[PDB]
């Protein structure tokens, strides 16, 4: 009466957020935030192997999660008891005054006892399932040449597996964090974008980052993303938080906090234009997505590999690459040119008049590599003023007469902001490439 350990680890990991985080979405309250804290702390569990026993700390806070689930069940049940008993009346549920404030600070009407029992049933069944599976069914039951060569060919396949998949998925992570700030520009993603630009100007220097410190950078990113998501969780709770942080203030606007009903003081109702439905109802779930995914890629990057003529075809490929280098001296200029035209800024006016003229220069590739960084500086301040023109504090900050004269105004459409930022990053990558080329040339020279 025992089961294998790999299935045990996979099943515990799978049912960990299944009955905890979905229960959190089912009944948003001060109880569900603790549920999601349990979900995260158990989501950073180490794996379980066939030859390795279950870790003691893993079981320790599995016991703590069962204890918390049982305590929540006991408290909710006893409250159900007292409430169903004492009144025994009032099929009309009329709600107002401070009584609703406390009972919605949480911790007959048909759907009251109903919605009380479903989270409890699910949580108790899942917690008992996990605990009993741990308790009874132990994970560990016990305490020619051509064929071998073909088997080793699979090892050659896995040699490229570690060589390339981890390498490419790292690239997808950089574009992953790039997309997050594009979607919803606010205080939550400003540090993401500024850190990305600084690590980009580091990616210019061509010297690989020391293999101990990007762990720290990404750890800070993970911690802030998780805490931000937790802050947005505490902002989508019942009445007490709403009363404390009223809808329509500048503080929610800066921090990236959104409304989900009339609210007022409390007006009461329920608690549930596609353009803007994309940011507001993308960002919460998808920042959960990035939070979990970046923890996963921290783990992956933690792992890795154990090791840590007269050819004319030659002619062609090599010569083409040299031509491509000449082309690299010009390509980025095309890009900024189009971008300036695309915007429509006295700033565009300047890119145009400033760039069109460094055009007649007789000495060429060398000059451009030399003057690229300050150009990186100019185009770098632009994305920042753009995130500014993005925040939903359009009118509260103010638009002086000078800003009226310049013509560069805010973006009343966050979908348009998503569009222009997505274009901005993809089309400003070439100046990063030019900076990389200049840094490599400087490194080569010395």
């Amino acid at each position: 009466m025992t089961v294998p350990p790999l299935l045990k680890s996979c099943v515990v990991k799978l049912l960990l957020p299944a009955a905890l985080l979905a229960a959190a979405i089912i009944r948003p309250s001060f109880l569900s935030i603790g549920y999601v804290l349990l979900a995260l702390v158990s989501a950073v569990l180490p794996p379980i192997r066939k030859s390795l026993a279950l870790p003691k700390l893993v079981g320790t806070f599995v016991i703590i999660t069962f204890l918390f689930c049982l305590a929540v069940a006991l408290g909710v049940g006893s409250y159900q008891i007292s409430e169903q008993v004492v009144h025994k009346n009032d099929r009309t549920y009329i709600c107002n005054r401070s009584d609703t404030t406390l009972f919605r600070s949480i911790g007959t009407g048909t759907f009251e006892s109903t919605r009380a029992f479903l989270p409890e049933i699910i949580a108790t069944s899942a917690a008992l399932l996990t605990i009993i599976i741990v308790m009874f069914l132990s994970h560990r039951d016990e305490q020619g040449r051509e064929q071998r060569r073909q088997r080793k060919l699979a090892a050659i396949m896995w040699s490229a597996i570690g060589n390339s998949l981890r390498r490419l998925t790292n690239f997808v992570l950089f574009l992953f964090t790039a997309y997050v700030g594009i979607v919803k520009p606010s205080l939550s993603n400003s540090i993401y974008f500024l850190a990305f630009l600084f690590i980009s100007t580091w990616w210019s220097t061509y010297t690989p980052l020391r293999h101990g410190v990007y762990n720290q950078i990404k750890k800070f990113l993970i911690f802030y993303s998780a805490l931000h998501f937790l802050v947005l969780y505490t902002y989508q709770i019942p009445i007490v938080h709403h009363s404390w942080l009223p809808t329509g203030s500048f503080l929610p606007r800066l921090f990236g906090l959104t409304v989900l009903m009339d609210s007022s003081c409390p007006e009461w109702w329920k608690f549930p234009d596609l353009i803007m439905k994309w940011p507001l109802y993308a960002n919460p779930i998808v920042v959960l997505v990035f939070f979990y995914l970046t923890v996963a890629q921290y783990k992956f990057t933690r792992n890795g590999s154990r090791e840590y003529k007269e050819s004319a075809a030659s002619k062609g490929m090599i010569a083409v690459m040299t031509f491509v280098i000449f082309h690299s001296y010009s390509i980025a200029l095309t890009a900024m040119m189009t971008w300036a035209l695309l915007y429509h800024s006295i700033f565009g006016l300047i890119l145009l008049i400033l760039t069109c003229i460094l055009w007649i220069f007789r000495d060429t590739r060398k000059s451009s590599f030399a003057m690229a960084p300050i150009i990186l500086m100019y185009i770098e301040f632009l994305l920042i003023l753009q995130y500014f023109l993005s925040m939903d504090i359009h009118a509260e900050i103010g638009d002086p007469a000078w800003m009226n004269f310049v013509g560069i105004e805010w973006t009343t459409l966050p979908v348009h902001a998503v569009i222009i930022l997505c274009v901005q990053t993809l089309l400003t990558l070439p100046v990063f490439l030019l900076l990389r080329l200049a840094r490599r040339e400087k490194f080569y020279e010395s």
Partner: protein
Amino acid sequence: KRWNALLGYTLFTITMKVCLQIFGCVFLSWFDQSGGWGKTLCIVRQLFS
């Protein structure tokens, strides 16, 4: 182990095969109204009773 595995489970799952159907046949309705109880009493009644 085999006794509890392929002998206990078969009888243990065949014993309700009659009382679950009598449950389904009993006092007409215990499942069908507006809001939120028996859509999850359905997810179980999609395969139990």
